PDB file of all heavy atoms in Angstrom:
ATOM      1  N   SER A   1       1.116   0.000  19.833  1.00  0.00           N
ATOM      2  CA  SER A   1       0.046   0.171  20.811  1.00  0.00           C
ATOM      3  C   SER A   1      -1.313   0.300  20.136  1.00  0.00           C
ATOM      4  O   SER A   1      -2.304  -0.266  20.609  1.00  0.00           O
ATOM      5  CB  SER A   1       0.328   1.387  21.690  1.00  0.00           C
ATOM      6  OG  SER A   1       1.314   1.090  22.661  1.00  0.00           O
ATOM      7  N   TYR A   2      -1.379   1.039  19.031  1.00  0.00           N
ATOM      8  CA  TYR A   2      -2.625   1.169  18.288  1.00  0.00           C
ATOM      9  C   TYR A   2      -3.078  -0.190  17.771  1.00  0.00           C
ATOM     10  O   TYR A   2      -2.260  -1.027  17.380  1.00  0.00           O
ATOM     11  CB  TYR A   2      -2.443   2.141  17.124  1.00  0.00           C
ATOM     12  CG  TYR A   2      -2.204   3.575  17.538  1.00  0.00           C
ATOM     13  CD1 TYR A   2      -0.920   4.091  17.605  1.00  0.00           C
ATOM     14  CD2 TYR A   2      -3.257   4.400  17.893  1.00  0.00           C
ATOM     15  CE1 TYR A   2      -0.696   5.397  17.990  1.00  0.00           C
ATOM     16  CE2 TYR A   2      -3.044   5.711  18.267  1.00  0.00           C
ATOM     17  CZ  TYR A   2      -1.761   6.202  18.322  1.00  0.00           C
ATOM     18  OH  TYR A   2      -1.549   7.503  18.705  1.00  0.00           O
ATOM     19  N   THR A   3      -4.394  -0.408  17.774  1.00  0.00           N
ATOM     20  CA  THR A   3      -4.925  -1.717  17.407  1.00  0.00           C
ATOM     21  C   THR A   3      -4.664  -2.036  15.940  1.00  0.00           C
ATOM     22  O   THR A   3      -4.603  -3.208  15.555  1.00  0.00           O
ATOM     23  CB  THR A   3      -6.420  -1.791  17.716  1.00  0.00           C
ATOM     24  OG1 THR A   3      -6.892  -3.121  17.471  1.00  0.00           O
ATOM     25  CG2 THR A   3      -7.203  -0.819  16.852  1.00  0.00           C
ATOM     26  N   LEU A   4      -4.516  -1.010  15.105  1.00  0.00           N
ATOM     27  CA  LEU A   4      -4.252  -1.211  13.681  1.00  0.00           C
ATOM     28  C   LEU A   4      -2.755  -1.026  13.407  1.00  0.00           C
ATOM     29  O   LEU A   4      -2.284  -0.017  12.885  1.00  0.00           O
ATOM     30  CB  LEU A   4      -5.158  -0.303  12.851  1.00  0.00           C
ATOM     31  CG  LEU A   4      -5.235   1.232  12.891  1.00  0.00           C
ATOM     32  CD1 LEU A   4      -4.234   1.942  11.995  1.00  0.00           C
ATOM     33  CD2 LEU A   4      -6.649   1.692  12.575  1.00  0.00           C
ATOM     34  N   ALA A   5      -1.996  -2.050  13.788  1.00  0.00           N
ATOM     35  CA  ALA A   5      -0.547  -2.055  13.648  1.00  0.00           C
ATOM     36  C   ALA A   5      -0.108  -3.333  12.954  1.00  0.00           C
ATOM     37  O   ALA A   5      -0.635  -4.411  13.245  1.00  0.00           O
ATOM     38  CB  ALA A   5       0.137  -1.936  15.009  1.00  0.00           C
ATOM     39  N   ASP A   6       0.860  -3.213  12.048  1.00  0.00           N
ATOM     40  CA  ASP A   6       1.386  -4.350  11.306  1.00  0.00           C
ATOM     41  C   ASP A   6       2.905  -4.288  11.283  1.00  0.00           C
ATOM     42  O   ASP A   6       3.484  -3.229  11.022  1.00  0.00           O
ATOM     43  CB  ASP A   6       0.834  -4.377   9.880  1.00  0.00           C
ATOM     44  CG  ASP A   6       0.886  -5.759   9.264  1.00  0.00           C
ATOM     45  OD1 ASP A   6       1.962  -6.146   8.762  1.00  0.00           O
ATOM     46  OD2 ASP A   6      -0.145  -6.462   9.287  1.00  0.00           O
ATOM     47  N   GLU A   7       3.545  -5.424  11.552  1.00  0.00           N
ATOM     48  CA  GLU A   7       4.995  -5.514  11.520  1.00  0.00           C
ATOM     49  C   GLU A   7       5.471  -6.064  10.178  1.00  0.00           C
ATOM     50  O   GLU A   7       4.695  -6.614   9.393  1.00  0.00           O
ATOM     51  CB  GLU A   7       5.507  -6.404  12.654  1.00  0.00           C
ATOM     52  CG  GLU A   7       5.292  -5.840  14.048  1.00  0.00           C
ATOM     53  CD  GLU A   7       3.897  -6.104  14.580  1.00  0.00           C
ATOM     54  OE1 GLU A   7       3.113  -6.783  13.885  1.00  0.00           O
ATOM     55  OE2 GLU A   7       3.589  -5.638  15.697  1.00  0.00           O
ATOM     56  N   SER A   8       6.775  -5.915   9.932  1.00  0.00           N
ATOM     57  CA  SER A   8       7.410  -6.393   8.703  1.00  0.00           C
ATOM     58  C   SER A   8       6.707  -5.840   7.466  1.00  0.00           C
ATOM     59  O   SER A   8       6.446  -6.554   6.496  1.00  0.00           O
ATOM     60  CB  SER A   8       7.455  -7.921   8.664  1.00  0.00           C
ATOM     61  OG  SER A   8       6.163  -8.462   8.450  1.00  0.00           O
ATOM     62  N   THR A   9       6.398  -4.547   7.507  1.00  0.00           N
ATOM     63  CA  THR A   9       5.663  -3.883   6.431  1.00  0.00           C
ATOM     64  C   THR A   9       6.633  -3.335   5.379  1.00  0.00           C
ATOM     65  O   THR A   9       6.875  -2.137   5.246  1.00  0.00           O
ATOM     66  CB  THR A   9       4.748  -2.808   7.013  1.00  0.00           C
ATOM     67  OG1 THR A   9       3.957  -2.219   5.974  1.00  0.00           O
ATOM     68  CG2 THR A   9       5.515  -1.746   7.811  1.00  0.00           C
ATOM     69  N   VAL A  10       7.191  -4.258   4.602  1.00  0.00           N
ATOM     70  CA  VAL A  10       8.080  -3.892   3.509  1.00  0.00           C
ATOM     71  C   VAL A  10       7.573  -4.381   2.157  1.00  0.00           C
ATOM     72  O   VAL A  10       7.836  -3.720   1.140  1.00  0.00           O
ATOM     73  CB  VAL A  10       9.512  -4.409   3.768  1.00  0.00           C
ATOM     74  CG1 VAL A  10      10.426  -4.123   2.585  1.00  0.00           C
ATOM     75  CG2 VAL A  10      10.071  -3.792   5.038  1.00  0.00           C
ATOM     76  N   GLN A  11       6.821  -5.479   2.114  1.00  0.00           N
ATOM     77  CA  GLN A  11       6.359  -6.073   0.867  1.00  0.00           C
ATOM     78  C   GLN A  11       4.850  -5.935   0.684  1.00  0.00           C
ATOM     79  O   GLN A  11       4.229  -6.780   0.033  1.00  0.00           O
ATOM     80  CB  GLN A  11       6.770  -7.542   0.810  1.00  0.00           C
ATOM     81  CG  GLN A  11       8.271  -7.755   0.721  1.00  0.00           C
ATOM     82  CD  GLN A  11       8.649  -9.221   0.688  1.00  0.00           C
ATOM     83  OE1 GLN A  11       7.792 -10.097   0.798  1.00  0.00           O
ATOM     84  NE2 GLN A  11       9.938  -9.496   0.538  1.00  0.00           N
ATOM     85  N   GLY A  12       4.256  -4.899   1.243  1.00  0.00           N
ATOM     86  CA  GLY A  12       2.816  -4.754   1.227  1.00  0.00           C
ATOM     87  C   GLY A  12       2.209  -5.260   2.521  1.00  0.00           C
ATOM     88  O   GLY A  12       2.680  -6.235   3.122  1.00  0.00           O
ATOM     89  N   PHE A  13       1.149  -4.594   2.963  1.00  0.00           N
ATOM     90  CA  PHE A  13       0.618  -4.852   4.293  1.00  0.00           C
ATOM     91  C   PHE A  13      -0.903  -4.858   4.277  1.00  0.00           C
ATOM     92  O   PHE A  13      -1.541  -4.464   3.301  1.00  0.00           O
ATOM     93  CB  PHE A  13       1.135  -3.822   5.310  1.00  0.00           C
ATOM     94  CG  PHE A  13       0.747  -2.404   4.999  1.00  0.00           C
ATOM     95  CD1 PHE A  13      -0.428  -1.869   5.489  1.00  0.00           C
ATOM     96  CD2 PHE A  13       1.559  -1.610   4.213  1.00  0.00           C
ATOM     97  CE1 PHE A  13      -0.781  -0.567   5.205  1.00  0.00           C
ATOM     98  CE2 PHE A  13       1.209  -0.308   3.926  1.00  0.00           C
ATOM     99  CZ  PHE A  13       0.037   0.213   4.422  1.00  0.00           C
ATOM    100  N   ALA A  14      -1.479  -5.309   5.383  1.00  0.00           N
ATOM    101  CA  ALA A  14      -2.923  -5.405   5.530  1.00  0.00           C
ATOM    102  C   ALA A  14      -3.444  -4.162   6.239  1.00  0.00           C
ATOM    103  O   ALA A  14      -3.157  -3.953   7.422  1.00  0.00           O
ATOM    104  CB  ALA A  14      -3.308  -6.664   6.303  1.00  0.00           C
ATOM    105  N   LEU A  15      -4.199  -3.340   5.517  1.00  0.00           N
ATOM    106  CA  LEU A  15      -4.889  -2.224   6.142  1.00  0.00           C
ATOM    107  C   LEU A  15      -5.990  -2.760   7.047  1.00  0.00           C
ATOM    108  O   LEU A  15      -6.927  -3.421   6.584  1.00  0.00           O
ATOM    109  CB  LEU A  15      -5.467  -1.301   5.071  1.00  0.00           C
ATOM    110  CG  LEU A  15      -6.072   0.019   5.536  1.00  0.00           C
ATOM    111  CD1 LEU A  15      -5.021   0.867   6.220  1.00  0.00           C
ATOM    112  CD2 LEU A  15      -6.671   0.761   4.358  1.00  0.00           C
ATOM    113  N   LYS A  16      -5.858  -2.483   8.349  1.00  0.00           N
ATOM    114  CA  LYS A  16      -6.708  -3.096   9.363  1.00  0.00           C
ATOM    115  C   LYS A  16      -8.006  -2.342   9.603  1.00  0.00           C
ATOM    116  O   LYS A  16      -8.882  -2.864  10.300  1.00  0.00           O
ATOM    117  CB  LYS A  16      -5.949  -3.210  10.685  1.00  0.00           C
ATOM    118  CG  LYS A  16      -4.763  -4.152  10.653  1.00  0.00           C
ATOM    119  CD  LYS A  16      -5.217  -5.596  10.602  1.00  0.00           C
ATOM    120  CE  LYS A  16      -4.033  -6.538  10.674  1.00  0.00           C
ATOM    121  NZ  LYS A  16      -3.373  -6.478  12.005  1.00  0.00           N
ATOM    122  N   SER A  17      -8.151  -1.132   9.065  1.00  0.00           N
ATOM    123  CA  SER A  17      -9.412  -0.416   9.214  1.00  0.00           C
ATOM    124  C   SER A  17     -10.547  -1.193   8.560  1.00  0.00           C
ATOM    125  O   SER A  17     -11.655  -1.275   9.102  1.00  0.00           O
ATOM    126  CB  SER A  17      -9.298   0.987   8.617  1.00  0.00           C
ATOM    127  OG  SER A  17      -8.461   1.811   9.409  1.00  0.00           O
ATOM    128  N   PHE A  18     -10.281  -1.776   7.393  1.00  0.00           N
ATOM    129  CA  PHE A  18     -11.220  -2.665   6.723  1.00  0.00           C
ATOM    130  C   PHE A  18     -10.591  -4.015   6.417  1.00  0.00           C
ATOM    131  O   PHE A  18     -11.261  -4.885   5.849  1.00  0.00           O
ATOM    132  CB  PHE A  18     -11.743  -2.017   5.440  1.00  0.00           C
ATOM    133  CG  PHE A  18     -12.357  -0.669   5.654  1.00  0.00           C
ATOM    134  CD1 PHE A  18     -11.570   0.468   5.685  1.00  0.00           C
ATOM    135  CD2 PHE A  18     -13.719  -0.537   5.845  1.00  0.00           C
ATOM    136  CE1 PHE A  18     -12.129   1.708   5.889  1.00  0.00           C
ATOM    137  CE2 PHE A  18     -14.284   0.703   6.051  1.00  0.00           C
ATOM    138  CZ  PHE A  18     -13.488   1.826   6.072  1.00  0.00           C
ATOM    139  N   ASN A  19      -9.323  -4.207   6.783  1.00  0.00           N
ATOM    140  CA  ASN A  19      -8.613  -5.472   6.592  1.00  0.00           C
ATOM    141  C   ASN A  19      -8.569  -5.870   5.119  1.00  0.00           C
ATOM    142  O   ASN A  19      -9.168  -6.865   4.709  1.00  0.00           O
ATOM    143  CB  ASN A  19      -9.229  -6.586   7.443  1.00  0.00           C
ATOM    144  CG  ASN A  19      -8.326  -7.799   7.560  1.00  0.00           C
ATOM    145  OD1 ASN A  19      -8.021  -8.464   6.570  1.00  0.00           O
ATOM    146  ND2 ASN A  19      -7.889  -8.091   8.779  1.00  0.00           N
ATOM    147  N   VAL A  20      -7.879  -5.080   4.312  1.00  0.00           N
ATOM    148  CA  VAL A  20      -7.678  -5.374   2.892  1.00  0.00           C
ATOM    149  C   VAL A  20      -6.190  -5.266   2.590  1.00  0.00           C
ATOM    150  O   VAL A  20      -5.500  -4.453   3.215  1.00  0.00           O
ATOM    151  CB  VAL A  20      -8.484  -4.427   1.985  1.00  0.00           C
ATOM    152  CG1 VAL A  20      -9.970  -4.606   2.223  1.00  0.00           C
ATOM    153  CG2 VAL A  20      -8.079  -2.987   2.221  1.00  0.00           C
ATOM    154  N   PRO A  21      -5.653  -6.058   1.667  1.00  0.00           N
ATOM    155  CA  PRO A  21      -4.219  -5.968   1.374  1.00  0.00           C
ATOM    156  C   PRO A  21      -3.903  -4.824   0.427  1.00  0.00           C
ATOM    157  O   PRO A  21      -4.621  -4.578  -0.549  1.00  0.00           O
ATOM    158  CB  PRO A  21      -3.907  -7.324   0.733  1.00  0.00           C
ATOM    159  CG  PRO A  21      -5.193  -7.738   0.123  1.00  0.00           C
ATOM    160  CD  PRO A  21      -6.272  -7.237   1.039  1.00  0.00           C
ATOM    161  N   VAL A  22      -2.809  -4.123   0.724  1.00  0.00           N
ATOM    162  CA  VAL A  22      -2.270  -3.077  -0.133  1.00  0.00           C
ATOM    163  C   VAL A  22      -0.853  -3.472  -0.522  1.00  0.00           C
ATOM    164  O   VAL A  22      -0.060  -3.898   0.329  1.00  0.00           O
ATOM    165  CB  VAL A  22      -2.301  -1.694   0.548  1.00  0.00           C
ATOM    166  CG1 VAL A  22      -1.537  -1.705   1.852  1.00  0.00           C
ATOM    167  CG2 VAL A  22      -1.732  -0.643  -0.379  1.00  0.00           C
ATOM    168  N   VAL A  23      -0.552  -3.351  -1.811  1.00  0.00           N
ATOM    169  CA  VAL A  23       0.687  -3.842  -2.397  1.00  0.00           C
ATOM    170  C   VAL A  23       1.311  -2.706  -3.193  1.00  0.00           C
ATOM    171  O   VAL A  23       0.593  -1.990  -3.897  1.00  0.00           O
ATOM    172  CB  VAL A  23       0.455  -5.067  -3.303  1.00  0.00           C
ATOM    173  CG1 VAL A  23       1.693  -5.376  -4.123  1.00  0.00           C
ATOM    174  CG2 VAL A  23       0.049  -6.268  -2.469  1.00  0.00           C
ATOM    175  N   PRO A  24       2.619  -2.489  -3.100  1.00  0.00           N
ATOM    176  CA  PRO A  24       3.257  -1.491  -3.958  1.00  0.00           C
ATOM    177  C   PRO A  24       3.490  -2.043  -5.354  1.00  0.00           C
ATOM    178  O   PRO A  24       3.905  -3.191  -5.528  1.00  0.00           O
ATOM    179  CB  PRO A  24       4.576  -1.204  -3.240  1.00  0.00           C
ATOM    180  CG  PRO A  24       4.888  -2.485  -2.559  1.00  0.00           C
ATOM    181  CD  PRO A  24       3.564  -3.053  -2.122  1.00  0.00           C
ATOM    182  N   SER A  25       3.211  -1.211  -6.353  1.00  0.00           N
ATOM    183  CA  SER A  25       3.443  -1.553  -7.748  1.00  0.00           C
ATOM    184  C   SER A  25       4.281  -0.455  -8.379  1.00  0.00           C
ATOM    185  O   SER A  25       3.961   0.729  -8.240  1.00  0.00           O
ATOM    186  CB  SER A  25       2.131  -1.723  -8.513  1.00  0.00           C
ATOM    187  OG  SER A  25       2.379  -1.955  -9.887  1.00  0.00           O
ATOM    188  N   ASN A  26       5.346  -0.847  -9.072  1.00  0.00           N
ATOM    189  CA  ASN A  26       6.279   0.141  -9.600  1.00  0.00           C
ATOM    190  C   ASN A  26       5.698   0.875 -10.802  1.00  0.00           C
ATOM    191  O   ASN A  26       5.976   2.063 -11.001  1.00  0.00           O
ATOM    192  CB  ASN A  26       7.598  -0.536  -9.971  1.00  0.00           C
ATOM    193  CG  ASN A  26       8.578   0.417 -10.621  1.00  0.00           C
ATOM    194  OD1 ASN A  26       8.598   1.608 -10.318  1.00  0.00           O
ATOM    195  ND2 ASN A  26       9.395  -0.106 -11.524  1.00  0.00           N
ATOM    196  N   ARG A  27       4.891   0.194 -11.610  1.00  0.00           N
ATOM    197  CA  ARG A  27       4.548   0.668 -12.945  1.00  0.00           C
ATOM    198  C   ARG A  27       3.122   1.213 -12.998  1.00  0.00           C
ATOM    199  O   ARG A  27       2.152   0.451 -12.929  1.00  0.00           O
ATOM    200  CB  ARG A  27       4.762  -0.453 -13.962  1.00  0.00           C
ATOM    201  CG  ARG A  27       3.998  -1.739 -13.693  1.00  0.00           C
ATOM    202  CD  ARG A  27       4.701  -2.913 -14.342  1.00  0.00           C
ATOM    203  NE  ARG A  27       5.938  -3.240 -13.643  1.00  0.00           N
ATOM    204  CZ  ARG A  27       7.150  -3.136 -14.169  1.00  0.00           C
ATOM    205  NH1 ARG A  27       7.333  -2.679 -15.394  1.00  0.00           N
ATOM    206  NH2 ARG A  27       8.205  -3.490 -13.443  1.00  0.00           N
ATOM    207  N   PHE A  28       3.011   2.528 -13.128  1.00  0.00           N
ATOM    208  CA  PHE A  28       1.786   3.250 -13.434  1.00  0.00           C
ATOM    209  C   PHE A  28       2.026   4.112 -14.663  1.00  0.00           C
ATOM    210  O   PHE A  28       3.176   4.419 -14.996  1.00  0.00           O
ATOM    211  CB  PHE A  28       1.307   4.134 -12.272  1.00  0.00           C
ATOM    212  CG  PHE A  28       0.711   3.376 -11.126  1.00  0.00           C
ATOM    213  CD1 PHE A  28       0.464   4.001  -9.924  1.00  0.00           C
ATOM    214  CD2 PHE A  28       0.342   2.057 -11.270  1.00  0.00           C
ATOM    215  CE1 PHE A  28      -0.107   3.312  -8.881  1.00  0.00           C
ATOM    216  CE2 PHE A  28      -0.226   1.363 -10.228  1.00  0.00           C
ATOM    217  CZ  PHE A  28      -0.450   1.991  -9.032  1.00  0.00           C
ATOM    218  N   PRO A  29       0.963   4.507 -15.363  1.00  0.00           N
ATOM    219  CA  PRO A  29       1.139   5.356 -16.546  1.00  0.00           C
ATOM    220  C   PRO A  29       1.771   6.694 -16.195  1.00  0.00           C
ATOM    221  O   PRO A  29       1.549   7.242 -15.113  1.00  0.00           O
ATOM    222  CB  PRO A  29      -0.289   5.533 -17.073  1.00  0.00           C
ATOM    223  CG  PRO A  29      -1.063   4.415 -16.485  1.00  0.00           C
ATOM    224  CD  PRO A  29      -0.446   4.134 -15.160  1.00  0.00           C
ATOM    225  N   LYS A  30       2.564   7.218 -17.127  1.00  0.00           N
ATOM    226  CA  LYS A  30       3.220   8.507 -16.971  1.00  0.00           C
ATOM    227  C   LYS A  30       2.880   9.385 -18.165  1.00  0.00           C
ATOM    228  O   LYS A  30       3.094   8.986 -19.312  1.00  0.00           O
ATOM    229  CB  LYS A  30       4.736   8.340 -16.849  1.00  0.00           C
ATOM    230  CG  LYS A  30       5.180   7.672 -15.562  1.00  0.00           C
ATOM    231  CD  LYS A  30       6.685   7.472 -15.538  1.00  0.00           C
ATOM    232  CE  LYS A  30       7.409   8.799 -15.386  1.00  0.00           C
ATOM    233  NZ  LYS A  30       7.170   9.403 -14.047  1.00  0.00           N
ATOM    234  N   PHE A  31       2.359  10.578 -17.891  1.00  0.00           N
ATOM    235  CA  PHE A  31       1.973  11.490 -18.959  1.00  0.00           C
ATOM    236  C   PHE A  31       3.218  12.048 -19.635  1.00  0.00           C
ATOM    237  O   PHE A  31       4.150  12.498 -18.964  1.00  0.00           O
ATOM    238  CB  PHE A  31       1.111  12.617 -18.397  1.00  0.00           C
ATOM    239  CG  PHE A  31       0.625  13.585 -19.432  1.00  0.00           C
ATOM    240  CD1 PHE A  31      -0.409  13.240 -20.282  1.00  0.00           C
ATOM    241  CD2 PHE A  31       1.183  14.843 -19.540  1.00  0.00           C
ATOM    242  CE1 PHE A  31      -0.870  14.125 -21.231  1.00  0.00           C
ATOM    243  CE2 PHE A  31       0.724  15.736 -20.486  1.00  0.00           C
ATOM    244  CZ  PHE A  31      -0.303  15.375 -21.334  1.00  0.00           C
ATOM    245  N   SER A  32       3.234  12.019 -20.967  1.00  0.00           N
ATOM    246  CA  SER A  32       4.438  12.313 -21.735  1.00  0.00           C
ATOM    247  C   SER A  32       4.350  13.609 -22.533  1.00  0.00           C
ATOM    248  O   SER A  32       5.202  13.846 -23.396  1.00  0.00           O
ATOM    249  CB  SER A  32       4.758  11.145 -22.670  1.00  0.00           C
ATOM    250  OG  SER A  32       3.687  10.899 -23.563  1.00  0.00           O
ATOM    251  N   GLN A  33       3.352  14.450 -22.268  1.00  0.00           N
ATOM    252  CA  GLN A  33       3.231  15.771 -22.885  1.00  0.00           C
ATOM    253  C   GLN A  33       3.168  15.678 -24.412  1.00  0.00           C
ATOM    254  O   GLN A  33       4.071  16.097 -25.139  1.00  0.00           O
ATOM    255  CB  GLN A  33       4.365  16.694 -22.422  1.00  0.00           C
ATOM    256  CG  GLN A  33       4.279  18.117 -22.959  1.00  0.00           C
ATOM    257  CD  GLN A  33       3.026  18.834 -22.507  1.00  0.00           C
ATOM    258  OE1 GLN A  33       2.923  19.256 -21.356  1.00  0.00           O
ATOM    259  NE2 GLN A  33       2.066  18.976 -23.411  1.00  0.00           N
ATOM    260  N   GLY A  34       2.081  15.080 -24.892  1.00  0.00           N
ATOM    261  CA  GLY A  34       1.783  15.119 -26.309  1.00  0.00           C
ATOM    262  C   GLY A  34       2.614  14.213 -27.183  1.00  0.00           C
ATOM    263  O   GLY A  34       2.762  14.493 -28.375  1.00  0.00           O
TER     264      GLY A  34
END
């Protein structure tokens, strides 16, 4: 019902507030304590 709605949102989706794509990425840096 909300105007900012997206279906099939499993592989990254379009944020409709500003209409930009957002994608999940598995790999970010992890702090390893020295």
Side-chain angles (χ1 to χ4, degrees):
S1 283
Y2 293 97
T3 186
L4 60 86
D6 203 278
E7 293 83 3
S8 72
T9 184
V10 176
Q11 293 179 356
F13 61 90
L15 188 61
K16 294 288 184 68
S17 290
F18 305 85
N19 195 297
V20 297
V22 58
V23 168
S25 176
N26 176 32
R27 57 205 72 245
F28 286 168
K30 291 177 71 68
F31 182 76
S32 59
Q33 183 62 75

